Structures are given as structure tokens and as C-alpha cells.
Amino acid sequence: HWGYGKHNGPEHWHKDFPIAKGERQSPVDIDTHTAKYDPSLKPLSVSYDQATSLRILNNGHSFQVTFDDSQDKAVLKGGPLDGTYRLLQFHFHWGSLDGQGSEHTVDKKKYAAELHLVHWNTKYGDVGKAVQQPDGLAVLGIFLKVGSAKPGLQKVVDVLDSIKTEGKSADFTNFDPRGLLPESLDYWTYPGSLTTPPLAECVTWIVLKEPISVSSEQVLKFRKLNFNGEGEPEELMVDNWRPAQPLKNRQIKASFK
Ligand SMILES: [N]S(=O)(=O)[C][C]C1234B567B89%10B%11%12%13B85%14B%1158B%12%11%15B%139%12B%1061B%12%112C5%153B%14874
Ligand SMILES: [Zn+2]
């Protein structure tokens, strides 16, 4: 039932998922002046050299690129994390226009899109078990602004015409997610949640300070996707972002001064 429209969007989700009004919901606004520099935070360790992408999929809420998470081939460690987190998939959230699309905001600024690289804690064995734990997932969030093209995104862009409508997938092997990362791994971190149903409070969020630039042509291809299935009335997959939620009793920590 849930989606991003008037009648099934974020303001409705608490009816099926009451944790929507919980104590550690995501995304949030990152108030940069209030975030505390924490000299105890480690550099983030991103080890993607042996990543194995499998498929690209439109599931009616975003598109995702899925990885082989049956071994420690593409792992996130360090930073605020204890232990080792396997990359399951990445996906994006984006807007109908360049002034909205991100889920996190920075001093209330919205970016055109936000990339989420979703990882789960190997100590829980599988993602389903991990989503039931407060330290089950680590999502690496990367902002997208519109300017110069991101060359490492183009292979993704170019196959979106083959997964237009909900329920389409395609082979998507040999994709290297290192080509989506900004120079700096400086980050903010806080305890939060999945930003889509089931909104489980299982995520350590790691949001990079440095956005990547993508071109207008690249983001326009995102906007040609459809929320609908083939044969149903065409509804552009745009504005698939949850707004900032109350910070409540949480501290955002910065890895950098
Ligand atoms: N937007 S997000 O918080 O990164 C949650 C995205 C997910 B990945 B795992 B299941 B797969 B399905 B559910 B679980 B995580 B939530 C949706 B996607
Ligand atoms: Zn997401």
C-alpha cells in the first residue's frame, strides 16, 4: 500500500508502521553547528575492491543495484562501527526538480538526490535478522548535487530504460561502486532507522559531508522511471524521499573539525 503520494506517502506510514513516530527515526536535518566533532571516531573503512554486483531492479520505490552478500567481498568497517558490515545494495532518492530529493538535509539544505549504500552486520548472519537489532545496519549516505557528470554513475543511468516500471530487473554485473564515492570520507553519524517501511530502528547512519556532482542528464534519467507497473497509469518515480524527522534525544557526531 505505501508509497510517496498524497494518500499513501510518509504522513500515512505510521498507520501500518507505528514506529514511524519513534525515538530514532531517519532521515534528520544535520545542523552542522550543533554536530559535535568527536576525535574518538575512526576513519571509515570502505573495502569495495571485490564487490560483485548482481542485478539492477525497479521495485516501485526506487531502483537498486544488488550485490553478492554471501561473503565479505564489499564491507564497511571502522568509523563509528563495531565489526564488519556487508554491502547488500545501493539505491537512490531523488526529486522532481533539483531543489529537493535528498532525505537528510544539511542546515535545512536539500540536495537533488541521495545515494544509500546499505550494509548489514555480519554478526547477525542475514539482513532480516539484522533489521531486528539496534546495530544491525550501517547505511552510507552520499548527497548528489547537479553540475558535472559523475562518470562512474553512467553505467547505471544507461540501463534505467530497461527497468522502467515496477517489477522490471536486469543483469548488472561488474559494476564498481567505488566510482560513486566523493574524495573525502569525512562524515556525520547518528543512530536512526530505515527511511522506508518497515522504518525499523536498526541503522547506524554515516552521511558523508562531501556531495558528488552528477549531471542534469543523469538525474533526468532517474526521473523517467515509473512508480507504476507496466500497463498501469504512468506516474513518474520522483520525490521518493521521506522528509526530516524529529531528532529527539540524539546527538549527531562529526568525524572532522
Ligand atoms: N532508505 S534506506 O533506509 O536505506 C532503507 C532501504 C531498505 B534496503 B533493506 B530492505 B532493502 B528494503 B527494506 B530494508 B533496507 B529497507 C528497504 B531496502
Ligand atoms: Zn534509502
Numbering used by the authors: 4 to 260
What do the authors say?
CA IX-mimic is an engineered variant that is widely used in structural studies to resemble hardly crystallisable CA IX. CA IX-mimic contains seven amino acid substitutions (A65S, N67Q, E69T, I91L, F131V, K170E, and L204A) in the CA II active site to mimic the active site of CA IX while retaining good crystallisation properties. Methyl and ethyl linkers (1a and 2a) did not allow carborane clusters to make favourable hydrophobic interactions with hydrophobic residues due to their short length. The largest extent of buried surface area was observed for compounds with short linkers. Clusters of 1a and 2a were buried deeply within the active sites of CA IX and CA II in a similar manner, not reaching the hydrophobic patch at the active site opening. These compounds have no selectivity towards CA IX.
Human carbonic anhydrases (CAs) are ubiquitous zinc metalloenzymes that catalyse the reversible hydration of carbon dioxide to generate a bicarbonate anion and proton. This reaction is essential for many physiological processes, such as pH homeostasis, bone development, and electrolyte secretion. CA II is highly expressed in red blood cells and is essential for blood pH regulation. The zinc ion is coordinated by three conserved histidine residues, H94, H96, and H119 (CA II numbering will be used throughout the manuscript), and as the fourth ligand serves the sulfonamide moiety instead of the bound solvent. sulfonamide complexes also provide additional hydrogen bonding between the sulfonamide nitrogen N1 and OG of T199 as well as between the sulfonamide oxygen O1 and NH of T199.
